Amino acid sequence: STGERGLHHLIWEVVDNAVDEAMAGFATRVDVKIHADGSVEVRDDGRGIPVPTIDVVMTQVGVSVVNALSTRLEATVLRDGYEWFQYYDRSVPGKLKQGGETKETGTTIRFWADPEIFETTDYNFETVARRLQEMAFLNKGLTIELTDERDGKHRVFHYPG
Numbered sequence: 743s744t745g746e747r748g749l750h751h752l753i754w755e756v757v758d759n760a761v762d763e764a765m766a767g768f769a770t771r772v773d774v775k776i777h778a779d780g781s782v783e784v785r786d787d788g789r790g791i792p793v794p795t796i797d798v799v800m801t802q803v804g805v806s807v808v809n810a811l812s813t814r815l816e817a818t819v820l821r822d823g824y825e826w827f828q829y830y831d832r833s834v835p836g837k838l839k840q841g842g843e844t845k846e847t848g849t850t851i852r853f854w855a856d857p858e859i860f861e862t863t864d865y866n867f868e869t870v871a872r873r874l875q876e877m878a879f880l881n882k883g884l885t886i887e888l889t890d891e892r893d894g895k896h897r898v899f900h901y902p903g
């Protein structure tokens with residue numbers, strides 16, 4: 743889908759994955775940031791995406807609609823004592839970069855939806871908030887924070903168990 747609905751679906755797919763970590767009791771929070779550069783960042787404190795050829799978990803990111811319909815995608819993993827960077831340039835992956843040391847675990851997915859593919863690229867804060875309100879309500883005790891850098895709109899979603 744190439745409209746505002748299909749654009750918002752890119753957010754739904756990234757968030758559904760982060761929320762799966764929470765359901766499973768690995769993640770406690772999800773942070774969604776709508777940037778001023780056209781990108782969306784989804785951060786969780788889960789296990790970190792692991793760093794046949796179709797046994798490589800990162801391949802699920804590479805083959806996804808989010809990576810296909812994005813000019814750029816940045817996957818940042820905090821796992822196995824290190825920070826890891828797996829970047830894609832127009833769906834094409836770069837080499838896996840091993841950064842600094844960390845005791846933390848988690849996944850950050852940042853994607854720039856293709857302005858040629860979508861005739862809008864303008865996310866709707868209310869639509870995102872509607873989806874994120876459902877994510878927190880289905881996962882009682884999970885904290886979800888939504889921030890929009892474009893206008894300073896901020897919301898916290900938490901339902902106490």
Ligand SMILES: Cc1ccc(-c2cnc(Nc3ccc(OCCCN4CCN(C)CC4)cc3)c(C(N)=O)n2)cc1C
Nearest residue numbers: 756759760763788789790791792797802803806808849
């Ligand atoms: C667009 C998109 C974005 C994120 C993800 C994604 C995938 N896996 C994830 N999580 C995840 C974490 C741990 C994990 O471990 C699986 C068990 C251990 N592996 C067994 C196979 N081995 C080769 C490696 C280790 C699998 C998935 C997460 C996330 N946000 O946590 N996101 C998927 C898609 C399609």
Ligand code: NA
Nearest residue numbers: 787788789847
């Ligand atoms: Na964690």
